[PDB]
Structures are given as structure tokens and as C-alpha cells.
């Protein structure tokens, strides 16, 4: 009757680059987790600390929907306990995560013949991200002794790189759209009930 705005999250025309992942708050609304399936060629729906089947019975204080795009071979990194270029330097889930991870193949939208280069990921970072950290800096990465002084060169690398999405690349290199739902419990009124 007062549906949560899951519609503008899962069915958004544009998704964010993973390094600049999007976060939407969700509160004061009736959440129906059954609309979520969208007929996508490689749909994936995993939950942690909670049962996917009984989600419609539960209440939470607040819900967070984070969204972004990655490679198919990278979808496995969006899980508690994982490491890899995405989990370490772009989007990190906590080990004690309570929530759900929904991913699907978006080759139809996010690829094109001649290539879509608009989606970026961080390739270089000196240390791992904390859970739910977002790093959007574009400082030249210093891989050696000499200072970079803002100019790319040897041992001086622009830290972000663009994905190349074309429809005929293999599935591991095809684009996937991801939504992460985190469920918060406080000693506060619940405002997201199914």
C-alpha cells in the first residue's frame, strides 16, 4: 500500500560504477521482497544471517540498497569473507553481514558493439577497504620511490580503469548488475516491514 522504492533501485536506467557505488536509504515503507526477480539470464539471490524465503515476515530499523556494475567473474567477490580486486579496493562486505546480494547479467543494456567504457573500477590501492567504505579519489598511484606529482608515467598510474563491455565477450567478461540489501537492527522503531 506504501511500497518501498525498490523499483527505482533494481530497475534504474543507469547504474553506478562499482568504485563509486550507489547507496539508497529505505525506511518508512512496506517492503515486498517478492517482486525482486526480473527474468534475467543469470539471476542470483543469496542471503546472510536471514532466510530468503521468510523475508516478507520481518521488520528492520532501516534498509540500505547499494548498487553497481562489475564483471561476471567478479560477482563471487560480493560476499562476506571474500578478497580480490573488487572486495579489497572497490566494495567490501563485513564478515558478519546480515542482508542479501542480488546479481544479474546485463549484457543487453551495458554492452554495445564498439564497446561501453563508461563503467570504472579501482585497480590500484595501497590498502584494503573497510566494510561499506567508498573511495572516489583519482590521485596518481605511486608504485615506487619517485613522487608522481600528478602526472602518469613509470611507477605512476591512474588508479581507475574502465571496463570494456561488448556483447560478444565471454560471460566472465560480460557486465553484471548488483544490488546489496543490508538490514539494520537498532533499539529504535522498525520502519521497514513486509
Amino acid at each position, epitope marked *: 500500500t506504501n511500497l518501498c522504492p525498490f523499483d527505482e533501485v533494481f530497475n534504474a536506467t543507469r547504474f553506478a560504477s562499482v568504485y563509486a557505488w550507489n547507496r539508497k536509504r529505505i525506511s518508512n515503507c512496506v517492503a515486498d521482497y517478492s517482486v525482486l526477480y526480473n527474468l534475467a539470464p543469470f539471476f542470483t539471490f543469496k542471503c546472510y544471517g536471514v532466510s530468503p524465503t521468510k523475508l516478507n515476515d520481518l521488520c528492520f530499523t532501516n534498509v540500505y540498497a547499494d548498487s553497481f556494475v562489475i564483471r561476471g567473474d567478479e560477482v563471487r567477490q560480493i560476499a562476506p569473507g571474500q578478497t580480490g580486486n573488487i572486495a579489497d579496493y572497490n566494495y567490501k562486505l563485513p564478515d558478519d553481514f546480515t542482508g542479501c546480494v542480488i546479481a544479474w547479467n546485463s549484457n543487453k543494456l551495458d554492452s554495445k558493439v564498439s564497446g561501453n567504457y563508461n563503467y570504472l573500477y579501482r585497480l590500484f590501492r595501497k590498502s*584494503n577497504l573497510k566494510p561499506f567504505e567508498r573511495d572516489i579519489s583519482t590521485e596518481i598511484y605511486q608504485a615506487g620511490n619517485k613522487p608522481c606529482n600528478g602526472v602518469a608515467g613509470f611507477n605512476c598510474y591512474f588508479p581507475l580503469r574502465s571496463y570494456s563491455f561488448r556483447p560478444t*565477450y565471454g560471460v566472465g*567478461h560480460q557486465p553484471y548488475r548488483v544490488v546489496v540489501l543490508s538490514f539494520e537492527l537498532l533499539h529504535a522503531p522498525a520502519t521497514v516491514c513486509g
Partner: antibody, heavy 118, light 109 residues
Framework: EVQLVESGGGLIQPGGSLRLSCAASGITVGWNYMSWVRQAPGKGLEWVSVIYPGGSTDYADSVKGRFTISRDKSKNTLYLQMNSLRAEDTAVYYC????????????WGQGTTVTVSS | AIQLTQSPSSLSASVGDRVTITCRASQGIPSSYLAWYQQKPGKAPKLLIYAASTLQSGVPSRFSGSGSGTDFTLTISSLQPEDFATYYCQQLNSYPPAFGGGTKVEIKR
């Protein structure tokens, strides 16, 4: 000026252990993806292991549970600890700096030879 | 995973020849995920080309690369005596990376 100098190879019985060292100059080991790659006599190249700038590690399947990559930032040195060695591990071992899509494996060590035989 | 197949296994050429070496991927990858290396007997591999067409610093301009999807190429426009060697292609941005089986460039007579 930029180089990787390896040491620690040699002759060993199956089941034994060896440690390989890769001292660096001109790159900062702790700030790079550093890989180990091996080449068996008469064969091609086989990736062995990697350590990320932030510390995560990865291994070829044939080596998991036996080999361990690590680094000493103070000595600017990369290491590979090799336990439970097998005859198939016989190879020239190279360390290299990996830049991925941003550059290849652009800097390589001279190689150190590992022979595993009874 | 990806498998890279190199072609031909060996090729015979003379100094001054235009020589082209092919690397074929099993599935289809960004052009920016391929690299080319040269190796001579008893020597470490040396990087030639990364991201399929970028000439590594210090490598003579007679070396060039091209390709995207599944079919990649390394070309030497005018072969010199020091070019006689073995050539490998490699997949980037992946652990474990695939390596091609190699192409040995050899002297014609």
C-alpha cells in the same frame, strides 16, 4: 636501475622445503602486485602466485596448501616459501611486477633454478 | 576460464621479412587484457606489448600488435637478426592468467 634479484633455489628431495627471495630496486614491493611465475625444462610459462598491494594472496591450484607468498617491506623483498615439494615443481622460478591492464609484467627477475628429485 | 592458442607453433623467416604471429582466445576478452613477451634460450621473458597494441618503452618500433575479441596479432615489420626468438602471449587482469604455448621464430635456409 630497476631490477629484481632472486636467490634461494637449489637441489632438494621430495617432501623438503625451500625459500625463494626476490630483492627489489626501483619498485616498492609493498605497493605492487607481485607475482611468481615458473618454467619447467623445455616448457612454457606457468603462473604460481600473487600478493596484492593491500596484502591479499592467490595461488595456482597445483600449489595450494604447499606454497606461501609473502613480503618484507623493510627489506623491500618478496618471498616464496615452498613446502612439501614435488618432482613436478622443478622449474626456473621468476618473480615479476604485475601491472595488469596498465602494463604487462614489465619487470622480471633473472630466475632461480629449483630441482626436486630423489 | 580462458585458453590462449598460438599460431604457428614455429615459423621460418629471413632477415627483412614481414612476420605475423597470432594468438587466439577461447572465449573473447577486452583488447586491453592481452600482452606479448619475447624469450631467448636461458633468459627471462621480456615484455613487448601490453593491452594488445601499446608498445612497451624501449622496444623497437618494428614491433606492433592488434586485435580484440578472440583474435590477436603480433607483427614484426622487418625482421632483424636479434628478433629470432620465442614469443608468448598472456591474458591480463586475471588470476590465474592463461599463457599461450609459444611461437618460435626460426632462420630460413
Amino acid at each position: 636501475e630497476v631490477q629484481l634479484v632472486e636467490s634461494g633455489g637449489g637441489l632438494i628431495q621430495p617432501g623438503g622445503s625451500l625459500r625463494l627471495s626476490c630483492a627489489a630496486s626501483g619498485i616498492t614491493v609493498g605497493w605492487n602486485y607481485m607475482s611468481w611465475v615458473r618454467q619447467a625444462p623445455g616448457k612454457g610459462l606457468e603462473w604460481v602466485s600473487v600478493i596484492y598491494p593491500g596484502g591479499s594472496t592467490d595461488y595456482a591450484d597445483s600449489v595450494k596448501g604447499r606454497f606461501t607468498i609473502s613480503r618484507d617491506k623493510s627489506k623491500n623483498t618478496l618471498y616464496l616459501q615452498m613446502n612439501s615439494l614435488r618432482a613436478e615443481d622443478t622449474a626456473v622460478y621468476y618473480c615479476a611486477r604485475d601491472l595488469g591492464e596498465a602494463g604487462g609484467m614489465d619487470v622480471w627477475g633473472q630466475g632461480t633454478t629449483v630441482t626436486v628429485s630423489s | 576460464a580462458i585458453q590462449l592458442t598460438q599460431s604457428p607453433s614455429s615459423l621460418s623467416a629471413s632477415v627483412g621479412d614481414r612476420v605475423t604471429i597470432t594468438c587466439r582466445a577461447s572465449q573473447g576478452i577486452p583488447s586491453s587484457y592481452l600482452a606479448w613477451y619475447q624469450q631467448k634460450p636461458g633468459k627471462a621473458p621480456k615484455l613487448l606489448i601490453y593491452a594488445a597494441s601499446t608498445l612497451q618503452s624501449g622496444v623497437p618500433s618494428r614491433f606492433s600488435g592488434s586485435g580484440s575479441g578472440t583474435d590477436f596479432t603480433l607483427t614484426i615489420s622487418s625482421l632483424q637478426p636479434e628478433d629470432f626468438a620465442t614469443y608468448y602471449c598472456q591474458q591480463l587482469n586475471s588470476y590465474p592468467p592463461a599463457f599461450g604455448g609459444g611461437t618460435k621464430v626460426e632462420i630460413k635456409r
